[PDB]
Structure 1
Amino acid sequence: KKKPQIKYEEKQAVMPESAAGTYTFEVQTIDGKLDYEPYFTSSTLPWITGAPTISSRTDPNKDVISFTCLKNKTVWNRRAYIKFKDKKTGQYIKGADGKADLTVNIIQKKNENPVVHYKWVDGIGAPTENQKIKMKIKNETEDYFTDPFVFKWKETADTKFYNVRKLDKLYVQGQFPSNYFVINGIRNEQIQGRDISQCWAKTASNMLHWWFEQNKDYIEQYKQKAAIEEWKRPLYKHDYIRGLQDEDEGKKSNIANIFRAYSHNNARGGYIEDGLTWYLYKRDGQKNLGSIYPGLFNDVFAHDTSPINIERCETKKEFEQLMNKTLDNKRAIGIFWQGYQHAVTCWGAAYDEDNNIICLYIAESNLPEAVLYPFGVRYKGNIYEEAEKNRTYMFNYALSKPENIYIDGLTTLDKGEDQWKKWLEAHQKGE
């Protein structure tokens, strides 16, 4: 009497559709019918209902194994594993090489028709359908990314986000104006500013434009009530001119021009939070960041009352908690990572029906178009039984082979409403 065995060609994944259902695969039964029991390697996987079972043994050559899945609402494949226990010995059955356990890889396919909702940074509106631009797949082929959340948000006269671009990247030698980089400075001096490594400053400038717009009425009062230092008076405005051609980027943003003319362009880079501090209040660390120190609202804010925060994330739970808190608190968003420290601005996020964050809409100062670009959000480990670390990779749809960008954290800028309120109540009490 030969011992019956089971076999399965492991290179064959079992791939159920995204729909809910009971799905099957076949296990070969050799020399009879082994007494075994299938088991998922994790029993707490929420999208699998119960254990797998042997649902038919009528064919002498094969067993049918069944398992039941919930609908995959997400835009990612998801993975489970089935092993088999010999019921007499209690031991896991060996695979073809005789050493590894026999393991069947289950990969339930993604939702091809997700319902997506969006959350944008407070005060910048939301894209109209006419402002959403589909994206060609690059290798530019004539294929397009076809998932609805993959769009560029085109800047127009009517859009309210900010995306200041690096003049060093836009510049075409011999075609752009020779004076493309010239800036008229605070003392009406002419300065040539370069921005090739100023990712951090472009991100700070975008956030500062948003902050000056949000706090426009407070800043008007501040200019009328504070004893402003004479040289700083021209800095209490923000001009961001939409509709300019690339050759005119030097005229587009007074804030970006201040960083370009008076900060540094060190190839190591800088930090978003340092640019934000430098613009808004005095701190000893930023003493030598530039050749001037704007510190425009030190009467309102100090480091103790700071509207700037820095937080890190290393899991899907950490990233999503941070993003949702920031978006629900009317804060602007800078994203950083070590690549030199890289920095971009985030203006919003796309969500699937499970509230997973699936895409970010990014002002990238290194990228050429006057648009926000979609950066897809992906994970390499399980998102149901999360490991100690599950980095939130970012996928640049615009690039022809997108290297993985592990988000390190978020530098955020709050409106500072309580601080502004306390400042204003203090002046009216003295009046």
Structure 2
Amino acid sequence: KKPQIKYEEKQAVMPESAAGTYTFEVQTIDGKLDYEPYFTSSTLPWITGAPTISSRTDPNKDVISFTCLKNKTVWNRRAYIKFKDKKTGQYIKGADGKADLTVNIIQKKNENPVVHYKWVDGIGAPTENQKIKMKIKNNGIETEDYFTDPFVFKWKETADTKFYNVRKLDKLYVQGQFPSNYFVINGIRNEQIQGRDISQCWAKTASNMLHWWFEQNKDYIEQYKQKAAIEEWKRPLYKHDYIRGLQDEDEGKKSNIANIFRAYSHNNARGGYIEDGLTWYLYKRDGQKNLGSIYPGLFNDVFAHDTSPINIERCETKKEFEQLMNKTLDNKRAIGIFWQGSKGNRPYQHAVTCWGAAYDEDNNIICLYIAESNLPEAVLYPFGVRYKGNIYEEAEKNRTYMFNYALSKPENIYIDGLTTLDKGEDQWKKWLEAHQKGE
């Protein structure tokens, strides 16, 4: 009788997050088969060495040992052990006699990660009094449990916060309760205009980024107003007013920039693009003609498409997403995100604004802080970052999925890329120097 080994593969081996040498048992039938265990990847950095048979003293079973590093991340991480017959060199067969015998190793996440944060330049950082914990909800009902990871917080807007989150009047509006004139805007010819925004996620994202940009360049823009030969109709557009502390019923009074998009741009049910709204506001490009009934193009002698402070990049792996986020965050740029996937049974594509990110001790990006013009509260919401494939030896694609803490469910929604808006310092400085050279 040939000895065999058996293992019930439905049982994962789940070591704790701490570093250590962990063990599981393999049943040895009719003797002690001469075999050697192997990880499916030998290069996984968080496993030190090969598995070994650490005890055979029990005639009925062997103990297998393997050694892990500490899992500092907030995600489980997987490895796989198979077994080779030391004589035939073949992999030993599992229970069905056709698949190789495989043991699933799942090292558990760190329950006490140390977290640090990076925020878009110039918006400050949340105080503890500005951070709001979130109730774990299930099927739509709060369980009165809360998400306990400390990076899971809403960043509440107050009189003192410096991010921007313009919200859709069409989402906030309650018919028969809100004022009948909720949607009215006083236009440029101080005419009365009623704008809707149910499909303007791209314009809300553009407006948030433009508020940040006008604030960061406020001194340059004051000089521009005084030195440039501004077109008469455009003069009132060289400011930004974002009024914090308003009620939902007063959202129409909150942002002059958002109101410009809502009054004069488009609300096509097909949507728009962040970068198109940004171009439309800042300089002339032929493609952005007919985006709306006016063309602000407010700084056309500062910027052109060749000197554009607007960039669009894509990401399909953890490495690419993280490279892009870090480059953007270390460079004084505002961040628009295009989300892509499925929400329910319908295709989903959405533009939101990102104001910062949380990192674990390995500098993995674990959560983003999002201005979400579709969500009701005047806060930034946390969106957790998750990966479906290995993050240590990455596949060709490993998309950056989003966890919706507000819906308290995972969704098949991921980040396709970023549209970023740079301060444009070199361009502004060159414009200013050219004026002083003419004086």
State TM-score, norm by structure 2.
0.97
Q: Within 2, Cα distance between the matches of 1:336 and 1:113?
A: 31
Instruction: Tell me how far 1:401 sits from its aligned partner.
Output: 3.0
What whole-Å deviation, never above 9, does each CA across 1:4-49 have from its counterpart, x for those lacking one? 0000000000000000000000000000000000000000000000
Q: Within 2, Cα distance between the matches of 1:402 and 1:301?
A: 41
Instruction: Tell me how far 1:299 sits from its aligned partner.
Output: 0.7
- Give the secondary-structure state (helix, strand or coil) at the position aligned to 1:37: strand
Q: Within 2, Cα distance between the matches of 1:400 and 1:48?
A: 33
- Give the secondary-structure state (helix, strand or coil) at the position aligned to 1:100: coil
- Give the secondary-structure state (helix, strand or coil) at the position aligned to 1:38: strand
1:36-55 correspondence to structure 2 within 5 Å: 36-55=35-54
Aligned 8 A contact 2:113 2:361 in 1: yes
State TM-score, norm by structure 1.
0.99
What whole-Å deviation, never above 9, does each CA across 1:210-245 have from its counterpart, x for those lacking one? 000000000000000000000000000000000000
What whole-Å deviation, never above 9, does each CA across 1:346-392 have from its counterpart, x for those lacking one? 00000000000000000000000000000000000000010000000
Aligned 8 A contact 1:268 1:341 in 2: no
Instruction: Tell me how far 1:406 sits from its aligned partner.
Output: 1.3
Aligned 8 A contact 2:164 2:212 in 1: yes
Instruction: Tell me how far 1:139 sits from its aligned partner.
Output: 1.9
Change (3 A) 1:383 1:291: same
What whole-Å deviation, never above 9, does each CA across 1:59-97 have from its counterpart, x for those lacking one? 000000000000000000000000000000000000000
Aligned 8 A contact 2:46 2:69 in 1: yes
Aligned 8 A contact 1:379 1:393 in 2: yes
Instruction: Tell me how far 1:402 sits from its aligned partner.
Output: 3.7
What whole-Å deviation, never above 9, does each CA across 1:319-364 have from its counterpart, x for those lacking one? 00000000000100000034x6410000000000000000000000
Q: Within 1, Cα distance between the matches of 2:83 and 2:122?
A: 56
Q: Within 1, Cα distance between the matches of 2:408 and 2:150?
A: 20
Aligned 8 A contact 2:169 2:252 in 1: yes
What residue in structure 2 maps to residue 226 of structure 1? 228
- Give the secondary-structure state (helix, strand or coil) at the position aligned to 1:258: helix
Instruction: Tell me how far 1:404 sits from its aligned partner.
Output: 2.2
- Give the secondary-structure state (helix, strand or coil) at the position aligned to 1:353: coil
Aligned 8 A contact 2:28 2:59 in 1: yes
Aligned 8 A contact 2:71 2:107 in 1: yes
What whole-Å deviation, never above 9, does each CA across 1:238-263 have from its counterpart, x for those lacking one? 00000000000000000000000000
Q: Within 1, Cα distance between the matches of 2:138 and 2:323?
A: 35
Q: Which structure dedicates a bigger proportion of its chain to strand?
A: 2
Aligned 8 A contact 2:167 2:372 in 1: yes
Mind listing any 5+ residue stretches in structure 1 that lack a counterpart?
Answer: none
Instruction: Tell me how far 1:400 sits from its aligned partner.
Output: 4.2
Aligned 8 A contact 1:206 1:345 in 2: yes
- Give the secondary-structure state (helix, strand or coil) at the position aligned to 1:382: coil
> RMSD of the alignment, in Å?
0.7
- Give the secondary-structure state (helix, strand or coil) at the position aligned to 1:288: coil
Runs of 4+ in 1 over 2 A off after TM superposition: none
- Give the secondary-structure state (helix, strand or coil) at the position aligned to 2:74: coil
Change (3 A) 1:402 1:23: closer
- Give the secondary-structure state (helix, strand or coil) at the position aligned to 2:204: helix
Aligned 8 A contact 1:269 1:341 in 2: no
Instruction: Tell me how far 1:423 sits from its aligned partner.
Output: 0.1
Aligned 8 A contact 2:13 2:103 in 1: yes
Mind listing any 5+ residue stretches in structure 2 that lack a counterpart?
Answer: 341-347
Q: Within 1, Cα distance between the matches of 2:172 and 2:422?
A: 31
- Give the secondary-structure state (helix, strand or coil) at the position aligned to 2:426: helix
Change (3 A) 1:202 1:178: same
Aligned 8 A contact 2:403 2:409 in 1: no
Instruction: Tell me how far 1:187 sits from its aligned partner.
Output: 0.2
- Aligned identity (percent) is 100
Q: Within 2, Cα distance between the matches of 1:377 and 1:139?
A: 20
What whole-Å deviation, never above 9, does each CA across 1:130-185 have from its counterpart, x for those lacking one? 00000011229211101000000000000000000000000000000000000000
